Design a protein around this ligand. Structure first.
Ligand SMILES: [Mg+2]
Ligand SMILES: [Mg+2]
Ligand SMILES: [Mg+2]
Ligand SMILES: [Mg+2]
Ligand SMILES: [Mg+2]
Ligand SMILES: [Mg+2]
Ligand SMILES: [Mg+2]
Ligand SMILES: [Mg+2]
Ligand SMILES: [Mg+2]
Ligand SMILES: [Mg+2]
Ligand SMILES: [Mg+2]
Ligand SMILES: [Mg+2]
Ligand SMILES: [Mg+2]
Ligand SMILES: [Mg+2]
Ligand SMILES: [Mg+2]
Ligand SMILES: [Mg+2]
Ligand SMILES: [Mg+2]
Ligand SMILES: [Zn+2]
Ligand SMILES: [Zn+2]
Ligand SMILES: [Zn+2]
Lengths: 57, 229, 173, 146, 129, 96
RNA sequence: ACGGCUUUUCCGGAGUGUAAAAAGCUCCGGGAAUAAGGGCUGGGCAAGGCCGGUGGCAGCCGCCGCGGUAAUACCGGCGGCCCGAGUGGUGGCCACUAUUAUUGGGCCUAAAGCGGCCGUAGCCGGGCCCGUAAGUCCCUGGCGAAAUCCCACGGCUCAACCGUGGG
């Protein structure tokens, strides 16, 4: 098999090999993994957990 | 692959890691090259590439792109410095480019090879030519661009067996990445070798920035990293 | 305007002194015992023309394109450069070595009628080899598959006698 | 400056006139179409010419080189104009005499003109009394009629 | 002054997607912009869109999904024949079947793939990939 | 030499028969016109006085030659139809 | 250096060929015999850090640059490289050149925005409904000689060349 390319939670684009992205468990519930790409972090875009629905940086 | 496996084994057992990612590699929690990318890690120890991609230490997988000597003026004469531009790769899907400086040529060559490893990237390969639709990863999957200084580079998919229709620096870099056929167009001062090489490297990196659909992956035979038969 | 002028059948290199190309071509010249560069260049051009026809036919559609597409495949398998079940994409994997293996010089050496490539060339030039009952003195002639096995010594040649001194030395190899 | 103009579908005449107007700013195009080189060429478009030697001279090399370059003054048969021509080779000036006839051709510098450390000389001697000068300088042949 | 409502709309969309906007408003609407938006939605380059009525020429509200590399008008609107699409593809697109050229035919507005299947030409008006 | 007849055609308008043939002869010179004519007239029962050989041609790397000949039923018709040069070259008549 | 072989080509003959000749082609006798040059050798750019001369003189140099008594760059010897019955010199056109730019260039500081503005022709022009069918797209009749170009098959030993069909 092959491997899956991670995707930003806010905008849905793929993460490039060496960009300044981040990922962490949901602060509210801890059941899902949030990914944020460099552009979304720079512009402070909001994000929403797909399980518990808690939103925002 | 028998030699470089034991080289990687030798390096691993006598290495004391100074960084968190180096520790993850030392303890067997990371076993593949593709697992160090796309998560924001800082890569600061060259032993990481030596363990995960040992074949970048072969002579056929390293190229010295150019050597220049530069001068600083002083009241006691001219102080001379060497600048070396070099590149490494695995001829499948990983490539890196680096610059080194030193008082003698050998020091600069060592440092330049060292910095190329630390600047490693993974790319995408495929077949996108109107006159060759073979779904094999011998070319770029679609047209891409890169730039540095006054230099602009555009890379275009080409038919199997065409060769690399590009200047020599671009030839060396593309060969180290595992690409056999391409067409190209350039603007600016290509005789500035540092900028020419950086523009080609940026163009290769930019294959990751194009948005694609699952259907496209089948149509162009897109492969990320190793071809993996 | 101007009337027709007959044009060269081969193309010259874009730069005369490139080290890598010189090394590659020297290896080929030594291996197949060619007389000069232009001979080699001739065969290179033949290969290029084949590929250029395949590249154009892949991106074409219509009724004449299909006829041309099947004619190209048929000609390539008649010369013995592709197997009977090949497709158009297979045209793009042909190498220069495929064409040189079809020279009458090479085939005379491969079958065991001579001991060396140089001897095969002299046998062809002096008129000791017959191809399907006809004597041909051109070492660069490309042999069709249908006539490959009817290639022998000429029936009027000194070599068409198993007791000839030079033939016994050829057979000892 | 805004967008390059005109871009319109029905603006063909103006676009063609613009391209024609600024093509006269290209010195290559202007010289060819106006035939300026033909108007001033002493060789009258020929690749070689024949002339008669009037005297021998020497030209100093330009800075920072030093040396004397040996040349001849030649009067051309076709129109009577006089031009200077270089004599290439070591000791070549010794094979030339006054009233001898020579064949000259271009010296081969940039833009079809002069070259090296001798600007002002545009031609070189190739034959002397219908014998190749290169042979004479090397040997292999003798200059006739003494 | 305003010369071309369709060019403004496509340049606006490509500017907005580069900074991650989730929706846009196309201010002077028209029927041709609506047909182009329908074709864009069919191939998955945009989400839902809706017409909003002022007393003026109307507004379009469009949802973006980050799936557009680039989009733009073609000026002048070159005529094209039914078997001549490849050279225009090489002019505007990055690989052999990558993206769409949008074509105005006497059978309506459609992608160049559908028109090539029908065997008709028309006028080029836009590209999206 | 071994002779093989390829075609015999009837031409009533001219009043002749036209004969195409091959000769197989490895290791031998090109056959002469006299020998070919004698063999042909024996092989077809012709009056040799009205038998004309048009040509005998050899090829580059071959062991055989191709030939063309004509046979008239009447001598006067032959003298009226055929050119003088071919009848002399075949020894039918004498050059003045 | 020994031992053996061959005869494309070469010398002398017979036949065929030809309007007649000559070439060409098939056979027979002799014999490795009868057959290599031009340019280059510091970088661009493949190839010498060897020897002997000359000493800012003579000379070389498309361009960059060599030569001022210890010249890898001039002249010559010996070596080496490229192409080869050819290989160098001079002049012209295209490419190189996105240095003419529709595709596809520039104009703050490098060549280049009229000192400023009003307006004629031209070019470019906001949304909806109905009609027309000039532009535009599709189908089909009559045309755009042959030679020249591309492909397959066939005839000259193959090819160049020539014929039959498709474009
Ligand atoms: Mg001081
Ligand atoms: Mg920069
Ligand atoms: Mg430039
Ligand atoms: Mg005329
Ligand atoms: Mg070299
Ligand atoms: Mg010169
Ligand atoms: Mg010396
Ligand atoms: Mg010398
Ligand atoms: Mg410019
Ligand atoms: Mg002003
Ligand atoms: Mg005004
Ligand atoms: Mg309108
Ligand atoms: Mg109409
Ligand atoms: Mg015609
Ligand atoms: Mg034949
Ligand atoms: Mg043929
Ligand atoms: Mg013909
Ligand atoms: Zn994002
Ligand atoms: Zn949650
Ligand atoms: Zn391909």
């Amino acid at each position: 098999l092959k491997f899956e390319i991670p995707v930003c939670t806010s905008c849905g684009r793929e993460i490039t090999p060496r960009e300044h992205a981040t990922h962490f468990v949901c602060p509210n519930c801890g059941e899902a993994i949030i990914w944020r790409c460099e552009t979304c972090r720079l512009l402070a875009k909001p994000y929403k957990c797909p399980k518990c629905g808690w939103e925002g940086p | 692959s028998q030699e470089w496996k034991e080289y990687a084994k030798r390096v691993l057992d006598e290495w004391q890691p100074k960084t968190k990612l180096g520790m993850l590699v030392k303890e067997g929690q990371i076993t593949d090259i593709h697992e160090i990318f796309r998560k924001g890690y800082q890569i600061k120890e060259p032993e990481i590439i030596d363990v995960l991609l040992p074949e970048v230490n072969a002579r056929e997988n390293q190229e010295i792109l150019d050597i220049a000597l530069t001068v600083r003026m002083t009241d006691s004469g001219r102080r001379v410095r060497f600048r070396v531009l070099a590149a490494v790769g695995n001829r499948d899907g990983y490539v890196g480019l680096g610059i080194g400086h030193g008082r003698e040529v050998g020091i600069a060559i060592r440092k330049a090879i060292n910095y190329a490893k630390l600047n490693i990237i993974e790319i995408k390969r495929g077949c996108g030519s109107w006159e060759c639709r073979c779904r094999r990863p011998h070319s770029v999957p679609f047209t891409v661009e890169g730039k540095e200084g006054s230099v602009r580079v555009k890379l275009i998919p080409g038919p199997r067996g065409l060769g690399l229709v590009i200047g020599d620096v671009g030839k060396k870099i593309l060969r180290l990445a595992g690409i056999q056929d391409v067409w190209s167009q350039t603007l600016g001062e290509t005789r500035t070798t540092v900028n020419f090489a950086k523009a080609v490297f940026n163009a290769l990196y930019n294959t990751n920035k194009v948005v694609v659909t699952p259907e496209m992956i089948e149509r162009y035979g897109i492969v990320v990293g190793r071809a993996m038969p | 305007g101007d009337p027709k002028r007959q044009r060269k059948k081969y193309e010259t290199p874009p730069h005369p002194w490139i080290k890598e190309r010189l090394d590659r071509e020297r290896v080929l010249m030594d291996k197949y015992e060619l007389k000069n560069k232009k001979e080699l260049w001739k065969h290179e051009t033949q290969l290029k023309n084949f590929r250029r026809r395949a590249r154009r036919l892949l991106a074409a559609r219509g009724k004449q394109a299909e006829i041309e597409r099947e004619q190209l495949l048929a000609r390539l398998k008649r010369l013995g450069l592709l197997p009977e079940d090949a497709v158009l994409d297979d045209v793009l994997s042909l190498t220069i070595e495929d064409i040189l293996e079809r020279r009458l010089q090479t085939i005379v050496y491969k079958k065991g009628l001579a001991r060396t490539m140089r001897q095969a060339r002299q046998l062809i030039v002096h008129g000791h080899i017959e191809v399907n009952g006809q004597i041909i003195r051109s070492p660069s002639y490309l042999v069709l598959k249908e006539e490959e096995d009817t290639i022998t010594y000429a029936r009027t040649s000194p070599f068409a006698n198993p007791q000839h001194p030079e033939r016994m030395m050829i057979e000892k190899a | 400056p805004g967008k390059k103009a005109p871009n319109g579908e029905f603006a063909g005449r103006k676009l063609k006139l613009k391209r024609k107007k600024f093509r006269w700013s290209d010195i290559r195009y202007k010289r060819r179409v106006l035939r300026l080189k033909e108007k001033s060429d002493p060789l009258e478009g020929a690749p070689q010419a024949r002339g008669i030697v009037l005297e021998k001279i020497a030209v100093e090399a330009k800075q920072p080189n030093s040396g004397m370059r040996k040349a001849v003054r030649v009067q051309l048969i076709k129109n009577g104009k006089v031009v200077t021509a270089f004599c290439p080779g070591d000791g070549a000036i010794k094979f030339i005499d006054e009233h001898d006839e020579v064949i000259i051709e271009g010296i081969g510098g940039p833009k079809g003109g002069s070259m090296g450390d001798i600007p002002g000389i545009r031609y070189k001697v190739v034959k002397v009394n219908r014998v190749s000068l290169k042979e004479l300088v090397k040997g292999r042949k003798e200059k006739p009629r003494r | 002054t305003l010369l071309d409502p369709l060019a403004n709309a496509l340049s606006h969309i490509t500017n907005s997607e580069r900074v991650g906007k989730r929706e846009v408003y196309i201010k002077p609407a028209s029927k041709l912009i609506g047909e182009v938006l329908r074709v864009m939605q069919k191939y998955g380059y945009i989400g839902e869109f809706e017409f909003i009525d002022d007393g003026r020429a109307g507004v379009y509200r469009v949802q973006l999904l980050g799936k557009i590399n680039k989009a733009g008008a073609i000026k002048p609107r070159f005529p094209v024949k039914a078997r001549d699409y490849e050279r225009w593809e090489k002019r505007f697109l990055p690989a052999f079947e990558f993206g769409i050229l949008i074509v105005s035919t006497s059978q309506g507005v459609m992608s160049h793939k559908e028109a090539r299947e029908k065997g008709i030409g028309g006028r080029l008006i836009a590209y999206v990939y | 030499m071994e002779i093989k007849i390829t075609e015999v055609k009837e031409n009533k308008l001219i009043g002749r028969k036209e004969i195409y043939f091959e000769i197989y002869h490895p290791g031998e010179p090109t056959p002469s016109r006299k020998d070919v004519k004698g063999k042909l007239v024996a092989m077809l029962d012709l009056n040799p006085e009205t038998t004309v050989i048009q040509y005998i041609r050899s090829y580059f790397g071959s062991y055989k030659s191709k030939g063309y000949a004509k046979y008239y039923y009447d001598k006067d018709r032959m003298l009226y139809i055929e050119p003088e040069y071919i009848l002399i070259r075949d020894g039918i008549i004498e050059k003045k």
